[PDB]
Design a protein around this nucleic acid. Structure first.
Lengths: 107, 93, 88, 98, 80, 95, 107, 93
DNA sequence: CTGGAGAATCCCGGTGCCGAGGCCGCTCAATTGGTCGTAGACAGCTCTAGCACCGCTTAAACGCACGTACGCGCTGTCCCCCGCGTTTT
């Protein structure tokens, strides 16, 4: 026939063949389903875009054209869902959300 | 030496969301860093459940439930759809 | 004379300086600082350090090396449940 | 007469500066020798990677940073504005870290 | 239906006593009642997720153990 | 009459060597089933599961109290107040 | 001939063969060294007794001849290194170490 | 059917330290639960350990090393010797 | 309201530059077409346990009085840490 990538077949972008190998060497089970490498791989696309779209948003708010960890730091930590997700993740060079305590504000 | 990573696919998705935005390399490494993590956390979680029910093969039933276990709230809700849509698309295709 | 021995007082741990400490605190959002903090901080930071460093070194020998790698310490961090992104 | 700012206005300005800044606040040369100091009590004569040498600081700071803001929470609840070690230790105990 | 209130004040006060509390406010009781729901709701949500995926309609503690660990509170004593 | 604060110490002394539950099971049991109703309908519980739940909950609650008590004491008090909980709830980072 | 159990020939108590099976069904890796099940077992008894005699001492101190969950709690929580290990760990019918802070006591 | 645990091996050891001390079932369940964990905690890391050096077979060294990862200080020094002795006793005969 | 006044900050246009990003060969991993063994969900049977309720009695809740101790608002007072300009480091 004609070679057609599974990612194309799912209409996805992430390399499922890579992971099905990786799942295969990942020793998570001695056998592995076929749609599982697929099933995860799309959701993989979801979160990256989800973060990437946020990464784009903050990137615009300082009027830059290229995304940086500070943007990444800001985006996820500005997202309560992502921040709850990545609470045990610390970001390299990401910095901190600017936030001064109310009582430190001068009378 | 050869090193395989995820930059190109991430680069493709970015141009899906922001077709004009650029990107650094360090942040790309972060993305590579991040993907592998969630890659790992799901899979072992996926593994041990199959252990909990004493099964030997991991399918989407396994994958989806842990995604519900791993992703909180709306992401889990929305991403399951993202998983659900692709799977049927693959089986149909 | 007798100047070859006039400065032997490094004793590294103060190398984390008060200006930095306050600079650190200022990024954190503290407005005013006790003076005993500086020393107390030195304790907290160090006691932090080895525990990973121990764990970080703990890897190294097992793979029979002599040069600590970032990836090595990368795993060192994960074990206590504070993960980092960005060094592969 | 000299134009001295009211004490604290400078600090709030400082607090602003670093919270937009993202760089390290700890000098590299003092920093790594600290680690090179530390390694001796586990194994003699190792050889450090700068990436590793770098990677230490981020955890080093990020850890201590989160400490600070919690410690800042203490005096506020303790109705202060100046931090005491009793605050610092308290959080670590609340962090369950003693 | 107000089963949260079924956790009485002495039920609250006993716990703080075993917690070592000498003197208690009155607003403490409602604060506790709301928060404890959060502990319970989070667990039971995830706990049943096991039961559903395990294709049962009956809640084993073995699920419960699985979850509480998955939250990070490891527990000994109820099978495994 | 005993002066206020004496029975409490005896109460505190009493319970720390006491070990069994301090929450009524049926008020415990009923509340569990109500809460579980909100995610899926028509469940069925093993007494172990509910009991296993109960051990977690009290064990949960008591530790927070100690943290809260520490908060209260640090404010130079002997009377806990909800903000102490919230300050405590914040620092552990589940807030 | 006459077989001799592996645990015996190491001078131990725990069934190493079970573990060897559990190891092989535990899918930690495709292959298992020969001395590994032994090594892991050796610690197992150690820790196992290491606590038990602690619980025995407490059971002696409460003057009961049988060890209970409360004994399990007290010794573990009274020894610091174990407590660090068992920090996220709850003992059913375990309880609390007795403790009242100094200022709480009357003067 | 037949489900297996560790209480018997516990109880010999009990009689090795306290030859005349009883133990409750609520306690015995606790030990069965407790031992199962401690197995698991190391068991994973050593498995992970093998992956870290791209090696492909678990040995006692990894277990040895893995124990060094968990157990605190002075206790680690004890068991590692005991781990050292037993295999030595095993390997000798 | 309004700032003398200094100082601080943001914004506007130039500069330099090197890294993000497409281009360019190349190989081995991902895709296709074959087999065969087993996993595992699914009907059938089993039966355990889960639920439902009663009824009764007593601990345990519950709804009150009372009294005082502690929470808190407030105010001088004192001293340690805050701004700053050189002098080291």
């Amino acid at each position: 026939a004609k070679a057609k990538t599974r990612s194309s077949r799912a209409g996805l972008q992430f390399p499922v063949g890579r992971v099905h190998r990786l799942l295969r060497k990942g020793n998570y089970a001695e056998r592995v389903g076929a749609g599982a490498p697929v099933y995860l791989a799309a959701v993989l696309e979801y979160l990256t875009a989800e973060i990437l779209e946020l990464a784009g948003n903050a990137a615009r708010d300082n009027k830059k054209t290229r995304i940086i960890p500070r943007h990444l730091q800001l985006a996820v930590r500005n997202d309560e869902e992502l921040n709850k997700l990545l609470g045990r993740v610390t970001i390299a060079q990401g910095g901190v959300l600017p936030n001064i305590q109310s009582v430190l504000l001068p009378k | 030496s050869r090193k395989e990573s995820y930059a190109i696919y991430v680069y493709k998705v970015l141009k899906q969301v922001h077709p004009d935005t650029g990107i650094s390399s360090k942040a790309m490494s972060i993305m590579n860093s991040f993907v592998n993590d969630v890659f790992e956390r799901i899979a072992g979680e996926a593994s041990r459940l199959a252990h909990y029910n004493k099964r030997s093969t991991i399918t989407s039933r396994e994958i989806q439930t842990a995604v519900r276990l791993l992703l909180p709230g709306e992401l889990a809700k929305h991403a399951v759809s993202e998983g659900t849509k692709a799977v049927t698309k693959y089986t149909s295709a | 004379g007798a100047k070859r021995h006039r400065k032997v007082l490094r004793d590294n741990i103060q190398g984390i300086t008060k200006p930095a400490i306050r600079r650190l605190a200022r990024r954190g959002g503290v407005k005013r600082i006790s003076g005993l903090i500086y020393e107390e901080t030195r304790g907290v930071l160090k006691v932090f350090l080895e525990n990973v460093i121990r764990d970080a070194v703990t890897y190294t020998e097992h793979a029979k090396r002599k040069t600590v790698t970032a990836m090595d310490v990368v795993y060192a961090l994960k074990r206590q449940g504070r993960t980092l992104y960005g060094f592969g | 007469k000299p134009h001295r700012y009211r004490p604290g206005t400078v600090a709030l300005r400082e607090i602003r500066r670093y919270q937009k800044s993202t760089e390290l606040l700890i000098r590299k040369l003092p920093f790594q020798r600290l680690v090179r100091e530390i390694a001796q009590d586990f194994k003699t004569d190792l050889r450090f990677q700068s990436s590793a040498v770098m990677a230490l600081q981020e955890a080093s700071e990020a850890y201590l940073v989160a400490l600070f803001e919690d410690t800042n929470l203490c005096a506020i609840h303790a109705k202060r504005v100046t931090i005491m070690p009793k605050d610092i230790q308290l959080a670590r105990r609340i962090r369950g870290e003693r």
